[PDB]
Structures are given as structure tokens and as C-alpha cells.
């Protein structure tokens, strides 16, 4: 019995390398994928939007849209989902973020919105944010050195809250090096991603997460990746 | 105005390389160090224990003992502090741990007891324990590889709680490597300590922490390093 | 003036993810790519091999074949190149390696044969082999720990020659950790590859290398990646 | 049969933390240590230098001096050894280096002079220098990032010779990170030392090395750590 069993997604972003990875991952999970898309699959022109989508959501009431698109399209693509009344999971970056949440909360529609869908990265982030809030000053006097490439903005925000001083594509690489005042203690965290699979699997995870909240007819309609993580592994 | 200003410690362990590091660190903090010790400083024979110590604690009511000693001496050295009524900070390992806490709670005496006093290591531990409890399963399917040398037992306990599979001297070294199922994501944590300075500074930290709880006449008498970390930097 | 300027390759392996990366890299270098292939490009059936290829090599005398194929095809695909008399660069693994060199040396034909074409990896290898031969025993008594994933067989051969004790897809990851006897010294080497671009660029490098040896009418006909590295950067 | 068996050293630097580590290491190797010293052991005033030392070197013809001292004392302490005619191993930094070699080559006296005595560090250096000279340009276009603390000047000299772009106490730490142009390949070297034991053991190694060259009545009188490494492990 697959866990995606009984769930359908529409993947608006079918051509992007991200969209593909999502398709691959959803297919593994047993999530069925409807063969229509927007701006094997039949892609659709950017007119007649409501009617194509309303009639899919009518034919597939278990449908959840996945949106991985363009910052200019966010506020537009969200105004569409809310008028049709279909839940969605959106990891796209950009747009009037305040207007985008406004749109969805007036619609009382169900959604997961997180510009970052690598759920393992989020967890490490959240730990280092809990640590910074629970144990203020614990690393007072330590220095931080960073190497990166082409997210780490919160990480430095935490280490400052912890008392430290400091000055989607293929690969990503992050290295953070904590040194003690007398330089006799070093901590080092290092992070390598090759591909977008980690983001796919987290998108699928939000999907499965969000199907459950719909089914349970939950009162909160809008969720983030931390919400997803707290539910536990649904796989 | 130093923060150790107004605080005195007796360092039972004056000859151990640890004891020295504590002395060095306490001296930096402005903590005054009484020149008597047990089993520059005048070391004392293991008889007449109560009287030597009672008359120091009478002469120095702001005294806090620091104990870094032998596992066989723990339950004995604690029964002494409680009869004199002097607060202590004990990082020694071993002994009947249940009998040792029993001894101190009957005395209603003030103490910090943590076999691990590198407070930065504790914080990382606590983050990874919060993460494991808040986000069950977040790393389901990841494999863990470990390299070590001559603590990491909880770390593997967490990563199992997070869904992962797996098979005091001079230096210490720990490396932990998390790999994703498709092996396209890696996290790596690495940890090097050279010396005992990190433990000294944390012992001093518990001391300053514990002076405050005494002064404030706090109701809880027995604390651990997590308690110390939650107070914030006192330096 | 591109450095691939004036050079043509045929890429037998046009469909493999490796073959693609080679095409991408050769295109950057200015290497022209003929649109025929074997077992945009027109792929050809596995019969009439000599005639198709003889007439390309007649039409394109500056042609160099690149072969990234199947171990069963090595000894066969090499017997073809030698009868036509066309230089090739082959990174495929497998086959009767002794029979494969026999085939080419009787033909007195020009070739680069290296199952490993990431030239940067080869260099590190060669350094650690020079070190092992020049400085026998230099790491006598050090221990070696290794983490890997899905090459490192020589690396351990070296470190044994240096006195140490020990027990093509998307990503690759290698970590090697040298620890001193008293465990107060650690060296750590770490190696991450995401993609096949590094192998492409080295294949192209052998190509440019081999065009020069042909042009200069050099007496040695068969080369490896070390030969390529000693020539210097040709880019 | 210890390998230091039959060899005696005088350790001018008996009080420095380095000198101690050397003593510890020489004692392990079976090297006998004479109980006189300069500027258990009896330390000597800085006058009557020649006579004290001439009469030790007369009483102990197998003596080899080890010098770990002050830059101002180098040129002076070397002029002393040469007039007495006693071999020495000197890792001290500073002084007129040209005048210091001049002094020793006129004396035709036997010596090892290397400001760096961690022989394992030297080996890695020499490999990366062989690599830079044998394979010019091999890392053309790679970027280099460096983290350090309180040597690496040659390392960057090599990586520039390899085509890369770039902008004695307790602990030491070095991390070097090589990234490919498309950022899909990373190499990382990392280096941690805690203590001076690694330098001691290399000093002892030069000593044993130098006893052999004396015994064999070798024609070259002045050696470096590379010479020591090429002999092989003498332990």
C-alpha cells in the first residue's frame, strides 16, 4: 500500500528541472499525476485558466496542485487556486508575499507555502534556532568562518544570537566553522546537495501532509515546512 | 568589574591537569581561589576532613567547592559537602549516582552536577535532542557514518529517533556524516578539542551560575549544565 | 580563437549521460562534432561499420573518435578503429585489457586510453604515489579511516606503502582521515563530485592533447591521463 | 633494541614546551640525554660556553646537539657548534640565514637545519610541490578558499603554479577548499595539530637520520627534512 495511494497532484512547472524531480518523487510515493499543466502531460495555454482547472478539480476532488514557477506568477497563480478552491503546495520564491497570504486566507483554502522544501535543511535550521533562543550567549566569544558557493542568512543570525562575531540550481555547498576564543575548540558543519531530489521528496512530503489535514477537516488552513516536520514521517 | 568578583572556590583536584585548567580559567574570571585542597595551594591529608572544611566555609561563606576527582571518592566527597553545608560544582564521573543525588537532596544543599562541563558540546546535544523530539522521523532513511578516537552515544540515540540506521584526556575528535537514501545529500558535523580549557570555562560558568541561585535564595537546589545554559551568558 | 578550433570528434556513446556531458564540454572548447554515431546526431546500426567510419575518416582526416561504451564492446570497438586507422580517446572500462593494447600497438595507431578521465583526481593520485615512493615510511604508525558511497584502492595502497594500517553515476563522495599514533595530529582529505562534467572536461583535454601529438607526428602512439597532465594546460 | 640506542643528545631549550616534547620523544626512542644545557638537567650560564661543550663532546663523541631557541641566538649558537665540531639538529626560526649556512659550511660540520620539523607536513608539502611542477595547469580555473588560525604560503604558491586564483604554539588548524569552475567538483584538505609531539618525533627522526650519515662518513654535511624523509623510516 503506497502512501501516495489515493492522492493526485497537478504539477504546474512540468518542464522545469525541479518539476521533473517532483514528478519522479511523487511517482515513487504512489501519487497519481494528472496529465494537464500550465504556462505524459499536455501543457495548456495561459487563457481559459479557471475552466480547465475547475473541471479538473471537479473530476478529481482529491487533487492537490504543486506550484514551482516564476515570482511574477505567484500572486497570479495563487488568486487562481483560491477562486477554484483547490489546495496547493507552493515552493516558488518571490511575489508580494503579504498579498499572497492575504489572497489565501480570504479564500479559507488549504495550502502549504514554504520557499524552502528540503525538509532536512529546515530541521537543522530549526534546531539551531531553538538552541539560539533557549541558550542565549552559549557561544559568546566564538568566531565564525563561512564558505559557500553560487539560507545561511538565518544561520549567522542565530550564531549572533548565540554570541558569535562575523564579517535552485544543481550543486550547493555550505561549510560553517566555529572556533573558540583560545582557538583550542572547533566545531564544523558541512552541507552538500547534488540534484533537486531533496526538494522533490519534501514537496511530496508536504503533499501527503496536506492531504491528511484536508481529510481530518482541520481548522488551520495554511501550513509551513515546520508544520510538516512536526507531524512526523508519513512515508 | 570582573564577574568572578566576590566568589571563592576550593578546587579539590589541584594536581590533575583538569584542576589546573580550572584554576587558570577561574583566575581569568576574577574568582578567588582558597589555598587549601584535599587528597599557592597547601594540600591536606584525608583525615580531619570536616574540621578543616567547616572552618574554611565559616571563614569564607561565599565559598563554592569544585570537585574533579575519582569515581570511588564521589559518594564520599559528596557526603562531606552536605554535612558542612557548602555548595559545590562536581564534574567527576562515576559512583553510585542514585546514592549521590540522595545524599544531596536530603541535605537541601545547593549544587551543580554534570559529568560533562563543555557547555558548548551540551548545547549541540540539546539542539539535536529537541530536533529529535519535535521532528520525529525527519531523517528517515538516511545512513550515519561515524569516526571517533580514544558522548556520541546520545547522538546516535537521536539520529535513530530521527529515523537513521547504524552499526578526559588531551585531544578529542568526532566526525558524523549523514547521507541521504539516493546519496545526493550529505550533512557532516565535526568536532575537535585540544586541551581541557573548554571544560574549565564551563565549570567556572556553573560556578558563576550557582552563586546567583544561592544569592537569589532559589528554591531548586540541584542543577545541571542545561540549567546553566538557559540562564544565559554570565560573563 | 578557441582551442578546440580545427578538431572534430565522433562521440560513440551519444545517448549516455556521459556522452552528453562530453558533447557539452567539447562544444564549449570549440571542438566540432560530426553528426554520426554507433550502437543533431544520426545514430547508425551496428553493421556496415567500417564503411561508414572509413568514409567519415576520409572526409574528416582531423577526426578523433571518443569512445564511452560497454565493456563487451571495448575489444570490438578498438579492432574497428585500428583497421580504419583513426585516432581515438577511450575511457570505457572493461574488456580484455591486454588484448585491447595488443590490438592498438600492432596498428601503430594514436590513442589515449584511461578508464579514469577526471584529470584532477589523477593528479592527486599521482602526487600521493610520488610521495609514497620518494618518502617510504613517512606515515609509519598512522591509522587510516575511510568513508565512501555507492579508485580509493590505490590510495590505500599508497598509505600502506607510507606505513599506514587499515581494515560512473551522479554523485561520488570520498573522505580519508589520517590520525597520528598519539592521536594529536589529524589530516583529512575529502572529495565531492556532482555530475560528469569533470570527466567530460578531461576527455576533451585528452582530445586536444592527442591532436597535438598527431600533428607533431610523435613517435609514442599510446598515452594515458598522466601523459596528458604532463603536457600542461592546453586550454 | 631501541633505535635511539647508542645516541646522545644535548637539548639546548630544556625549559621550552618544545624542548620538553623533544625530551619525551627522544626518551621513547632510546636516545640518551646528557644533563647539561644552555641559556634531570643542570642548566648553565652563557659564559664558558666552549669549554663546557668541548668537554662534553670530548666525553660523549656520539653527541648530537638539538637547538630550539631564539632567532637572535641562531647565528651565535651555530658559531659555537662549528668551533667545537659537534653535529647539531636545529629547528629554530630566524637569524641571518645566509650567515648561518656560511658558518656551518666553512666548518665542514654535520647538521640538519629545517625550521619545520613536522615531517608529515613536509611530505604533503613536497607532494603538492611535485604535483605543481610535473602537472602545470592541472587545476587551471579552480578557485581556492582558505581557513586558518593564529606554511600555507607555499601551498598557495603551488596552487597558483597549478592554475588557481586567490585573494610554535598549542593548536594549529588549516583547511583548504578547491572548487571547480562549474562548482560541481570540490576537494578539501584539512589539518589539525594539538601539541608539539609531531615536531618532537620529527626532530628525533632527524637525529637518528644524522647519526647514520655521520657513521657512514657521508660527504654531504648539511641536510633538510626532505633528506630525512627520503632515507625512509628509521624507527
GROMACS .gro file of C-alpha atoms in nm, chain A residues 30-184:
model
  155
   30UNK     CA    1   0.241   0.635  -0.541
   31UNK     CA    2   0.094   0.980  -0.603
   32UNK     CA    3  -0.107   0.993  -0.922
   33UNK     CA    4  -0.023   1.278  -1.161
   34UNK     CA    5  -0.289   1.433  -1.382
   35UNK     CA    6  -0.172   1.498  -1.742
   36UNK     CA    7  -0.252   1.869  -1.765
   37UNK     CA    8  -0.032   2.167  -1.675
   38UNK     CA    9   0.002   2.543  -1.719
   39UNK     CA   10   0.229   2.808  -1.873
   40UNK     CA   11   0.258   1.214  -2.040
   41UNK     CA   12   0.143   1.573  -1.977
   42UNK     CA   13  -0.048   1.808  -2.209
   43UNK     CA   14   0.055   2.166  -2.130
   44UNK     CA   15  -0.212   2.434  -2.162
   45UNK     CA   16  -0.223   2.794  -2.280
   46UNK     CA   17  -0.249   3.073  -2.022
   47UNK     CA   18  -0.612   3.152  -2.111
   48UNK     CA   19  -0.926   2.968  -2.008
   49UNK     CA   20  -0.746   2.907  -1.680
   50UNK     CA   21  -1.042   2.878  -1.442
   51UNK     CA   22  -1.246   2.645  -1.661
   52UNK     CA   23  -0.974   2.391  -1.738
   53UNK     CA   24  -0.881   2.385  -1.369
   54UNK     CA   25  -1.236   2.394  -1.229
   55UNK     CA   26  -1.326   2.090  -1.439
   56UNK     CA   27  -1.015   1.900  -1.327
   57UNK     CA   28  -1.086   1.984  -0.963
   58UNK     CA   29  -1.446   1.872  -1.025
   59UNK     CA   30  -1.330   1.546  -1.187
   60UNK     CA   31  -1.052   1.499  -0.927
   61UNK     CA   32  -1.170   1.625  -0.586
   62UNK     CA   33  -0.862   1.465  -0.422
   63UNK     CA   34  -0.643   1.689  -0.635
   64UNK     CA   35  -0.363   1.897  -0.485
   65UNK     CA   36  -0.175   2.140  -0.707
   66UNK     CA   37   0.203   2.175  -0.682
   67UNK     CA   38   0.339   2.513  -0.793
   68UNK     CA   39   0.711   2.569  -0.875
   69UNK     CA   40   0.709   2.863  -1.109
   70UNK     CA   41   0.801   3.233  -1.155
   71UNK     CA   42   0.798   3.512  -0.891
   72UNK     CA   43   0.577   3.729  -1.115
   73UNK     CA   44   0.328   3.439  -1.139
   74UNK     CA   45   0.297   3.371  -0.763
   75UNK     CA   46   0.035   3.632  -0.678
   76UNK     CA   47  -0.147   3.549  -1.001
   77UNK     CA   48  -0.127   3.169  -0.974
   78UNK     CA   49  -0.250   3.190  -0.611
   79UNK     CA   50  -0.551   3.406  -0.698
   80UNK     CA   51  -0.648   3.126  -0.939
   81UNK     CA   52  -0.627   2.839  -0.691
   82UNK     CA   53  -0.838   3.026  -0.436
   83UNK     CA   54  -1.122   3.101  -0.678
   84UNK     CA   55  -1.136   2.736  -0.782
   85UNK     CA   56  -1.098   2.626  -0.419
   86UNK     CA   57  -0.825   2.365  -0.474
   87UNK     CA   58  -0.548   2.302  -0.220
   88UNK     CA   59  -0.192   2.364  -0.330
   89UNK     CA   60   0.168   2.328  -0.217
   90UNK     CA   61   0.386   2.621  -0.336
   91UNK     CA   62   0.763   2.639  -0.308
   92UNK     CA   63   0.812   2.921  -0.558
   93UNK     CA   64   1.006   3.225  -0.439
   94UNK     CA   65   0.907   3.588  -0.492
   95UNK     CA   66   0.594   3.798  -0.531
   96UNK     CA   67   0.409   4.024  -0.289
   97UNK     CA   68   0.428   3.779  -0.004
   98UNK     CA   69   0.184   3.976   0.208
   99UNK     CA   70  -0.067   3.994  -0.079
  100UNK     CA   71  -0.019   3.620  -0.143
  101UNK     CA   72  -0.116   3.516   0.211
  102UNK     CA   73  -0.399   3.773   0.210
  103UNK     CA   74  -0.536   3.605  -0.102
  104UNK     CA   75  -0.537   3.258   0.052
  105UNK     CA   76  -0.671   3.345   0.397
  106UNK     CA   77  -0.977   3.521   0.249
  107UNK     CA   78  -1.044   3.207   0.047
  108UNK     CA   79  -1.016   2.989   0.361
  109UNK     CA   80  -0.840   2.741   0.127
  110UNK     CA   81  -0.584   2.476   0.235
  111UNK     CA   82  -0.218   2.524   0.143
  112UNK     CA   83   0.146   2.464   0.227
  113UNK     CA   84   0.370   2.763   0.147
  114UNK     CA   85   0.747   2.732   0.204
  115UNK     CA   86   1.011   2.877  -0.031
  116UNK     CA   87   1.243   2.605   0.107
  117UNK     CA   88   1.130   2.243   0.070
  118UNK     CA   89   1.441   2.050   0.166
  119UNK     CA   90   1.287   1.944   0.492
  120UNK     CA   91   1.616   1.815   0.637
  121UNK     CA   92   1.774   2.158   0.591
  122UNK     CA   93   1.475   2.316   0.768
  123UNK     CA   94   1.513   2.084   1.066
  124UNK     CA   95   1.881   2.176   1.119
  125UNK     CA   96   1.774   2.537   1.089
  126UNK     CA   97   1.503   2.491   1.350
  127UNK     CA   98   1.736   2.316   1.593
  128UNK     CA   99   1.987   2.598   1.562
  129UNK     CA  100   1.702   2.845   1.619
  130UNK     CA  101   1.576   2.661   1.927
  131UNK     CA  102   1.932   2.648   2.053
  132UNK     CA  103   1.973   3.023   1.997
  133UNK     CA  104   1.653   3.107   2.185
  134UNK     CA  105   1.688   2.856   2.470
  135UNK     CA  106   2.060   2.909   2.538
  136UNK     CA  107   2.136   3.276   2.476
  137UNK     CA  108   2.505   3.354   2.470
  138UNK     CA  109   2.623   2.993   2.480
  139UNK     CA  110   2.887   3.062   2.213
  140UNK     CA  111   2.980   3.411   2.336
  141UNK     CA  112   3.329   3.492   2.208
  142UNK     CA  113   3.348   3.223   1.938
  143UNK     CA  114   3.432   3.334   1.585
  144UNK     CA  115   3.252   3.210   1.275
  145UNK     CA  116   3.405   3.144   0.933
  146UNK     CA  117   3.192   3.057   0.630
  147UNK     CA  118   3.247   2.908   0.284
  148UNK     CA  119   2.962   2.891   0.030
  149UNK     CA  120   2.919   2.899  -0.350
  150UNK     CA  121   2.683   3.044  -0.621
  151UNK     CA  122   1.957   3.031   0.365
  152UNK     CA  123   2.284   3.086   0.558
  153UNK     CA  124   2.145   3.429   0.648
  154UNK     CA  125   1.944   3.287   0.939
  155UNK     CA  126   2.235   3.065   1.042
  156UNK     CA  127   2.450   3.372   1.101
  157UNK     CA  128   2.153   3.541   1.266
  158UNK     CA  129   2.144   3.251   1.515
  159UNK     CA  130   2.515   3.243   1.584
  160UNK     CA  131   2.496   3.615   1.656
  161UNK     CA  132   2.203   3.543   1.891
  162UNK     CA  133   2.441   3.281   2.038
  163UNK     CA  134   2.720   3.539   2.084
  164UNK     CA  135   2.936   3.495   1.768
  165UNK     CA  136   3.124   3.761   1.565
  166UNK     CA  137   3.124   3.772   1.185
  167UNK     CA  138   3.217   3.992   0.886
  168UNK     CA  139   1.758   2.643  -0.717
  169UNK     CA  140   2.048   2.508  -0.925
  170UNK     CA  141   2.250   2.186  -0.950
  171UNK     CA  142   2.509   2.179  -0.671
  172UNK     CA  143   2.502   2.363  -0.341
  173UNK     CA  144   2.772   2.369  -0.076
  174UNK     CA  145   2.792   2.526   0.273
  175UNK     CA  146   3.066   2.499   0.537
  176UNK     CA  147   3.049   2.670   0.877
  177UNK     CA  148   3.341   2.668   1.117
  178UNK     CA  149   3.310   2.769   1.485
  179UNK     CA  150   3.631   2.844   1.670
  180UNK     CA  151   3.668   2.907   2.042
  181UNK     CA  152   3.846   3.216   2.183
  182UNK     CA  153   4.167   3.036   2.276
  183UNK     CA  154   4.125   2.852   1.941
  184UNK     CA  155   4.152   2.512   2.113
   0.00000   0.00000   0.00000
